[PDB]
Amino acid sequence: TIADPSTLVVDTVGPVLTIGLNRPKKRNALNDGLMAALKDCLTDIPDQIRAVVIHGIGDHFSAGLDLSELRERDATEGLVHSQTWHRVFDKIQYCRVPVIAALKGAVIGGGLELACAAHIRVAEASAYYALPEGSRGIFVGGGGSVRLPRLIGVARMADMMLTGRVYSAAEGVVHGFSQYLIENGSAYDKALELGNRVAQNAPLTNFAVLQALPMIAEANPQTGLLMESLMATVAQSDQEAKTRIRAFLDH
Amino acid sequence: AATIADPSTLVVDTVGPVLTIGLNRPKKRNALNDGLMAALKDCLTDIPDQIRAVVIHGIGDHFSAGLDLSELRERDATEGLVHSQTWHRVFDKIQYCRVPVIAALKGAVIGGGLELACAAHIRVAEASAYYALPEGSRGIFVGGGGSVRLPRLIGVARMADMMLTGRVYSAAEGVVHGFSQYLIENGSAYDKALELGNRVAQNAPLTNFAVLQALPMIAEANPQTGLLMESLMATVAQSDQEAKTRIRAFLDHKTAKV
Structure with a gap:
């Protein structure tokens, strides 16, 4: 082909x-x-x-x-x-x-x-x-x-x-x-x-929603919940998220 | 056919x-x-x-x-x-x-x-x-x-x-x-x-049931689920007349021995 x-x-x-x-x-x-x-x-x-x-x-x-x-x-x-x-x-x-x-x-x-x-x-x-x-x-x-x-x-x-x-x-x-x-x-x-x-x-938004979300939702709930805390903590701790948090908070 | x-x-x-x-x-x-x-x-x-x-x-x-x-x-x-x-x-x-x-x-x-x-x-x-x-x-x-x-x-x-x-x-x-x-x-x-x-x-027949059928399913279930299913299989088994009969005889033989 x-x-x-x-x-x-x-x-x-x-x-x-x-x-x-x-x-x-x-x-x-x-x-x-x-x-x-x-x-x-x-x-x-x-x-x-x-x-x-x-x-x-x-x-x-x-x-x-x-x-x-x-x-x-x-x-x-x-x-x-x-x-x-x-x-x-x-x-x-x-x-x-x-x-x-x-x-x-x-x-x-x-x-x-x-x-x-x-x-x-x-x-x-x-x-x-x-x-x-x-x-x-x-x-x-x-x-x-x-x-x-x-x-x-x-x-x-x-x-x-x-x-x-x-x-x-x-x-x-x-x-x-x-x-x-x-x-x-x-x-x-x-x-x-x-x-x-x-x-x-933010690119990590994309990652988390496109990749991680469908896998979290489909997991055993206890598994999806821990996977969620891990994705969230990583997202939140990213530089882009801090920059977006600060800009909004600064006014 | x-x-x-x-x-x-x-x-x-x-x-x-x-x-x-x-x-x-x-x-x-x-x-x-x-x-x-x-x-x-x-x-x-x-x-x-x-x-x-x-x-x-x-x-x-x-x-x-x-x-x-x-x-x-x-x-x-x-x-x-x-x-x-x-x-x-x-x-x-x-x-x-x-x-x-x-x-x-x-x-x-x-x-x-x-x-x-x-x-x-x-x-x-x-x-x-x-x-x-x-x-x-x-x-x-x-x-x-x-x-x-x-x-x-x-x-x-x-x-x-x-x-x-x-x-x-x-x-x-x-x-x-x-x-x-x-x-x-x-x-x-x-x-x-x-x-x-x-x-x-x-x-007892319910032992064969729990072991042959329920156990494989419980073991491959997600844990929280296999666990509740176990409690449920357990209570049914234990509350059955054949189980009680056996527990009667087990405790009547130790009180025969004493």
Whole structure:
């Protein structure tokens, strides 16, 4: 696989790295080229970048798997292929900086898996969510079975997969698909505002919320509690936190 | 669709309150196959009330050399998933048996035979017993519960080494690394296993319940949880009529002695 840079639009707007999925003729379907190029933009991110917005060019975030490029795979090949998708999504989930996905139109299959890997999702009214692979006998291979139940619970996912059930953006915000809904206006603009806001954070804030928080929450409570006192004491004792404490306190 | 039992592959007796189950394909060292496994599941289904222990043992010089290599059936990915699951359902009747299961080990205890042995609650090993997972040689992983049960006995590190290199362990080595709780250096694992079955036979049913089922769960729980669960198992056990009867008799015999 060679990364295909043509399938993305990458820009920097102040301290926000923006990454637009750019295959609007195929509704931003993910193929290997797209995913390898995306993996690249998320590697060795320049230090002036303090947030990432992933968005879609055109009406749609992503319709998921490229059905043209539909390949033929044995059990072994499919394990390797899914694992490669996982390694790309790892660059999102474990990004050094918060990744915010601006969702609109189709957020479907691997598109939804991709939105799941981001930290914050902002949904415009037109967005919708589906896991339509089930109808073709295909389970998810892009992290969805681990990431989406953490947002929406097993039972709603299981129903989606069994019946092809679709959710709107408006239903979706209540059920856990996104933290934000923009009923009138643009997901991209709001993600950019959010990007600019999270860009003000101390780096250790990011670490603690992006890395430590999901692990603390998932631990035995006694374990998570001690891990919390440790993360907190380290955060609090950092120079940046003292500088922020003093500035505010000084007036 | 289910596989039909071949009961001729097993020799089943009842000695007092011990159901004895002898693996009986000696010409192939008690190589496991679908009908033996189905017959096995049958013996452990609806085990009559008079039975208070199960000894599984091998006819011949060997316990089991594992999967019958003359009886390989070609299987796609889905089929091999279904087939693995099938074997798991047989071993669940050992692990979750209502009475304790003791495996008498001698000669070959390898591959599926080790996995069978792992499902048992207690293993007694004669000097000749030897342990291996030769499957890795053949490009293949275990499908009989071994990656779950065995590391709990001997740890991942020793398992991983056995699989990557074909390392074999004797009965003497094995009692030390965790393969068996007992070693019989002279005489017979069967004889020992049968005296153990007579001994567990004396236990109250709720003791078998707490030990066989609750204990593993409590021990792998997070500590605060296993602990509350222990208090709960403990109080139920202790407040049961069989327990009180035994405590009555224990304190009536010391007041008989005085």
